Design a protein around this ligand. Structure first.
Ligand SMILES: O=C(Nc1ccc(C(=O)NCc2c(C(=O)O)oc3ccccc23)cc1)NC1CC1
Length: 167
């Protein structure tokens, strides 16, 4: 028994709620919150900017030191850094960006990173396909992640189509 509340059971290990992950992070203080990062860990907008803003830019300061030491992540890769005031840990995961010509097939490799953590609060990845084929992103999560994932979905048009499609 964990502390996630109001999430709907989608599958054996996947749960889903209509909410802003940042606001959910401010609440539960989970062991792991997932960030939909870019390979430079430049947290300008979206989940990254919203998470980073909620940390008063401490996430960005830590991230810049990480990149200066290690260089950029791979698309489909991840790193574990501090969760700051939002979680014990933040798993920064890079999904492919179709807007930059990156290959959507890398989405499965991105979700595989979740399997290194028993329980995670996470968003859907590759938001660049959210108008073209939003269902594609959630199908991969369910078919790839075997650990317990609590998905916080921001868009209500989306959540309704998603839960409808998988029930
Ligand atoms: O900006 C924020 N939050 C914030 C910002 C951005 C997101 C986000 O990239 N989600 C991913 C997503 C969603 C959804 O979540 O609807 O659907 C999808 C379909 C396909 C692929 C991906 C997705 C999530 C949360 N907060 C600030 C104003 C206070």
């Amino acid at each position: 028994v964990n502390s996630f509340s109001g999430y709907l059971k989608l599958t054996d290990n996947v749960y889903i709620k209509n909410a802003d992950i940042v606001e959910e992070a401010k609440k539960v203080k989970p062991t792991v919150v997932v960030n939909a990062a870019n390979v430079y860990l430049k947290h300008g907008g979206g989940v990254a900017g919203a998470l980073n803003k909620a940390t008063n830019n401490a996430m960005q300061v830590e991230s810049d030191d990480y990149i200066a030491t290690n260089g950029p992540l791979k698309v489909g890769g991840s790193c574990v850094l501090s969760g700051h005031n939002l979680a014990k840990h933040c798993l920064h995961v890079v999904g492919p960006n179709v807007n930059k010509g990156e290959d959507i097939q890398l989405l499965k490799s991105a979700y595989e990173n979740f399997n290194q953590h028993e329980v995670l609060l996470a968003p859907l990845l590759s938001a660049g396909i959210f108008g073209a084929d939003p269902i594609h992103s959630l199908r991969v999560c369910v078919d790839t992640v075997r650990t317990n994932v609590y998905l916080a979905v921001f868009d209500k048009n989306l959540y309704d189509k998603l839960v409808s499609s998988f029930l």
